[PDB]
Symmetry: D2
Subunit: 244 residues, 4 copies
């Protein structure tokens, strides 16, 4: 408790799934949270139950103007902005033959460009504050490949890289940038996926809060010397070789 005292965070894609879990987890640690999404109905709903510590904003991460508005909301409503959780993302699949180029561009827009746009938008207030933490949500698909998962793999790897380039540039201003790489997490994005799809050492899929616990760590000043790094929370999948 209180591990995020005085902190203000902005979470993209926070109306449901892991994003919603991150909002709740940070609020529980004392942070004020602005969360944006395109699911306004659900967004306003949870904002009502977290009203005193969180605010919902309509945010399509593919639009820079909306990102600016989200950041201004945090600054004007809560006083500042110290944490950014680039969580918004989509999942589409397809083999090289069936995958539509429109699907490829769409996932690049949301999963990659959306993350970059978020970073661009939060740096001004963070630099003025002299401190900040940017947490980009990648995945283990950003560490290795998967059949018929080209756009998703490409963007998750890209996010992994962008985390490092921005980390190097922003470090001198007191802003850390790290990426989180989870394995299968029980959320609506993978509800159709069997929980044991991956070979894991722990033998189970993850609960969203297990990823939120990592977000809290990275958002807090406890992780003050970690930047440009990959934090894996996958139950051990990438730690082992793929066996038959």
């Amino acid at each position: 408790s209180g591990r995020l005292t005085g902190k203000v965070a902005l979470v993209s894609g926070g109306a449901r799934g892991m994003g919603a879990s991150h909002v709740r987890a940070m609020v529980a640690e004392g942070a004020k949270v602005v969360f944006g999404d395109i699911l306004d109905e659900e967004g306003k709903a949870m904002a009502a139950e977290l009203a005193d510590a969180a605010r919902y904003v309509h945010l399509d991460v593919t639009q820079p103007a909306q990102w600016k508005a989200a950041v201004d909301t945090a600054v004007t409503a809560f006083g500042g902005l110290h944490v950014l959780v680039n969580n918004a993302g989509i999942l589409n699949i397809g083999t090289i033959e069936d995958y539509a180029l429109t699907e490829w561009q769409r996932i690049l827009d949301v999963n990659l460009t959306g993350v970059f746009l978020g970073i661009r938008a939060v740096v001004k207030p963070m630099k003025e504050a002299g401190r900040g933490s940017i947490i980009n949500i990648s995945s283990i698909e950003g560490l290795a490949g998967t059949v018929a998962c080209h756009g998703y793999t490409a963007t998750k790897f890209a996010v992994r890289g962008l985390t490092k380039s921005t980390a190097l540039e922003l470090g001198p201003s007191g802003i850390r940038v790290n990426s989180i790489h989870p394995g299968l997490v029980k959320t609506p994005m993978t509800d159709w996926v069997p929980e044991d799809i991956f070979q894991t050492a722990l033998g189970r899929a993850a609960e969203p809060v297990e990823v939120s616990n990592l977000v809290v760590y990275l958002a807090s000043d406890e992780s003050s010397y970690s930047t440009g790094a990959e934090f894996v929370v996958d139950g051990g999948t990438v730690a082992g070789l793929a066996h038959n």
Copy 2:
């Protein structure tokens, strides 16, 4: 030797720099090469000296129709297509604040989407042949970050990941996909960069042919059991830790 005799290859961005070096290197090893670029003047120039061993075609890697035309050219002129070298690429830079969104979009289109389009275009002729080798040109900027080099870092990391997802999917068809990661290479793309910018064990920048030698290895059947892997040719930069 004639390490590539019987092989037909398609090289993007082959009008100059490493691309041109790769075309010459493979032709020297007995390959028939179709190479495309947007620099038609220079492209047609070298096509003339390479005689009946190589054909030049205008190819903007961001356009799927042009990729298809280049592949059709290779199949009709040489009877098939067994090797693809996704070499075309651009370099732009800028801090998070100053970097233009148009530049970000353009580099994603050329460096990332262009590579994916190349893969899509060659799958058919390669699967028909039951064999194939796709070589994607990433870089050490696809292994670590660089200040004010976000679009480039993101795309090179993306290419690294796409190499893996496609390798897994195409393996069953006898097609290998690998990525090459060079350090500073002496070409027009980085002629404005001091040659000793990187801390190398070899204490020098790379010569294009030194990368072409790796392209030949991966294009040949000698590398038959290597796929989805990263081949680093950087003089030792990423093998060491960055010192101040």
Copy 3:
């Protein structure tokens, strides 16, 4: 908070430096800690101030019998053992020609075998508890090489690998195994090294507690879905490319 209340931990090399910082940090979070070392003077000294929260034991990590005695101490004094911090280690250097074989053998014994012996010693009490967290201290020298630092590099890379093999094997028993990779940390091991030797995004060396914060996270149940993974705390060094 009391993020480790109820947990019992064993820390090797806990008489000074990071080890001592880890013991203090975990005790502050409610853990009961048994810490061992070969520096008995300093070890007993801090055990006295930590009072009933910590016990000091002489522990040469190269000796299996001493590891067993330390574990028995933890179980008898605190009722069990849930966390192991394999922190003991030494640093020696030398060029390929000048580096003494005795030094190579000694560092393998302490930095590598010592870590394995620790893992062996705690498996029983942890499996009995059905839970556990093993934290192995590697370093960025376990991610990249360093001139005239062969024994150290080899062992730190080995620890990184051992972390994975054991994580996979122990996962089914509810035991997590992860590795920590710090950059330059201000301790007596590297006091002879200039603090700005590495190119860091944060432009400074690490403080021991900054690593201890990561140890606490991994020791706590908050990191329940992370195992077999590398946690980097280097201020951004490995996230960037080495410049000359």
Copy 4:
């Protein structure tokens, strides 16, 4: 053919398996080869059929004196020494509970120390020549973990690291050092292992010559700008995530 003209190489563990394959492959490319092992019967046998281009020497890689003798044999019998293939290795397994410490030390001695001793022994003549290539045989077990494979995993990771530290130190002298990481290869070491143990994109185990082709590339001057790097030849295993 002739890709190793004028080159003299030393191969440890070359009496059978991959080592024997490497000897044959390099001899076929014009290299003179001294190969050492502890299987003298078999060693002298193949030396008789390759007599004009290869010489067998008794070499226990755990003994520095024997390494010196092997190097002197290459220098005095063939005129110099330009390539070293640290191939000698053993495989033992066991869970944390059953694995004997004698087995652990033995594999550290052969797989790790043996490799270091080889590097120490070849540097003198290589530095005098001003050029050389050291090829260390690691494995994908040096990139990820495996249950009940602790000593093997630890040593293969260690070899991976030692490759980088030595590469950085030796680069200025014109000596490159790289590591090879193969997947399952059909040799007597894994004859008891099912060929489809790993999930591979190519759907088959490797033939030793497929690894030897990589040794030839790295031994040749074609790979002149690659050093401190990992070359994976595993049919795509590590390129993908472990799925059930």
